[PDB]
Amino acid sequence: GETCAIPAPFTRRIVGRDGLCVDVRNGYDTDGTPIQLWPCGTQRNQQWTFYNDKTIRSMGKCMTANGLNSGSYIMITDCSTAAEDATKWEVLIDGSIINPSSGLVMTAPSGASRTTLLLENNIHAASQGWTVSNDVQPIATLIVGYNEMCLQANGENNNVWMEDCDVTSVQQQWALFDDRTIRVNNSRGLCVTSNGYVSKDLIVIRKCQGLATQRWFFNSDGSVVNLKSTRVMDVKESDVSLQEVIIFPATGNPNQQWRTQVP
Amino acid sequence: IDYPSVSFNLAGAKSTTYRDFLKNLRDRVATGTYEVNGLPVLRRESEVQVKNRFVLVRLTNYNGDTVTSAVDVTNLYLVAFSANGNSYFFKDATELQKSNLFLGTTQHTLSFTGNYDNLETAAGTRRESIELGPNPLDGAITSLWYDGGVARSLLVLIQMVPEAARFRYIEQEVRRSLQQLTSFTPNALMLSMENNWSSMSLEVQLSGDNVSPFSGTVQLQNYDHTPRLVDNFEELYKITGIAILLFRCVAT
Ligand SMILES: *[C@@H]1O[C@H](CO)[C@@H](O[C@@H]2O[C@H](CO)[C@@H](O[C@@H]3O[C@H](CO)[C@@H](O)[C@H](O)[C@@H]3O)[C@H](O)[C@H]2NC(C)=O)[C@H](O)[C@H]1NC(C)=O
């Protein structure tokens, strides 16, 4: 065999709602200082170092969940005196920072600048969608699915179906937000929303509100699965003419496969 | 040994035929529960018998002339190829392959390792200008078939199959190529992720299963040539469309 290697501490940013970063209020390294959402940028309060022990901290003061219980906000405090469990965090590829011991996840009720974060009942919402990285800029990409066709965006509240790929039509230009949501590059105001949590449920392009329906996880298998409902987005009956993509039990078939291609 | 094999005839070949072909090749070399975030980790020398050390790729050109190249299950490498009672192995050529691949043909080893640089240097050109596609594939197989199998042709194959086998980005790049029946040349990105398979490999093995951030960063590149450093898996996938991981370290 050949055991891996214990990674050292690394500093990365944290985004998870309307392109806003997570940081310490007024950059005060003082204890008790709460954590809130705020426009990204070069500033320590925004930078967070991740350690092997499972901690995350800026300015040196560990990021702990302060009080503990669905609704308890987060803040920064000395690592030593920090409550053993209230300082350990988990960052699953599902784009969520869950707190081990508790089971609550860093939730952002609203995505308004200055909005304070807090541990809350994990329900799978865009609010509870975070992505740690130094590049707080989402990548533009076309969602090519069935028959090398690109997923097309229509009108607000309107459906979304497969249309002949066109690297020029902005209606096919999708911006993958760090909050684990998919919004129109043209207008990042509307996220790819679903109409229900049952199979055959129609998908559309509703507004962005952090709803559990606007939370999309890109499975490494090539399927864009809805987190709340294990259903995946697919080409209804395969008949692209029907003009409708919906949520449906993962079958492992091509009509459920999607490829995210650059610009 | 009668190593398993997958085929792909350019003639009457649709984008889907290619996509399916690649899948099969993956289901082959990619086995063994060891896998992170859903992506498998190609076995290592110790955990792979000679009876399953190689997989053959039967590629049929338009004119029907089909050439076959064996891939190394432990890395998806183009170990060698054979054309009508003829077999060729790179300057390297281990006794394992030299004594188990295309037994019966003429075993004349080429004069340059499979290393990308080695090929580009032998082909007199760099990947950045060896256009791949439906037609380029035909000429490739053809050149390997008749001309004996030069570097350039091999370089055209390596990316069209192994590369596309581990990178779905390259997959679709080819899929659209056959779809529109038009060629294309590797861009800064495709070429970058092409050189960062090992790096991004361990970077993902480091973080581990269900872990998003990377202990380090992957040095990819945009078309303009500017550096595109991905620090998380989600990014690496949504861009490189990676589907095959290379072993470097074992979980911890
Ligand atoms: C996706 O949509 C977003 C907008 O929702 C685009 O963002 C920004 O787009 C502008 C225009 O191309 C980029 O440059 C701008 O140029 C104008 C004209 O010189 C200038 O007045 C602006 O100050 C800015 O330099 C800008 O770089 C780009 N990104 C950002 C972060 O601002 C984006 O370009 C769209 N992406 C694609 C692939 O269409």
Ligand SMILES: Nc1nc(O)c2nc(CNc3ccc(C(=O)O)cc3)cnc2n1
């Ligand atoms: N003959 C041959 N056959 C390949 O399949 C291949 N793939 C790549 C591109 N991908 C890799 C793969 C592995 C490694 C590493 O272990 O270091 C580096 C780059 C480059 N040359 C290659 N040459």
Ligand SMILES: OC[C@H]1O[C@@H](O[C@H]2[C@H](O)[C@@H](O)[C@H](O)O[C@@H]2CO)[C@H](O)[C@@H](O)[C@H]1O
């Ligand atoms: O609280 C919101 C947001 O504001 C900034 O905080 C301070 C910053 O730490 C300080 O160095 C500067 O002089 O004044 C800012 C006032 O807003 C930070 O940019 C950010 O991280 C948050 O702290």
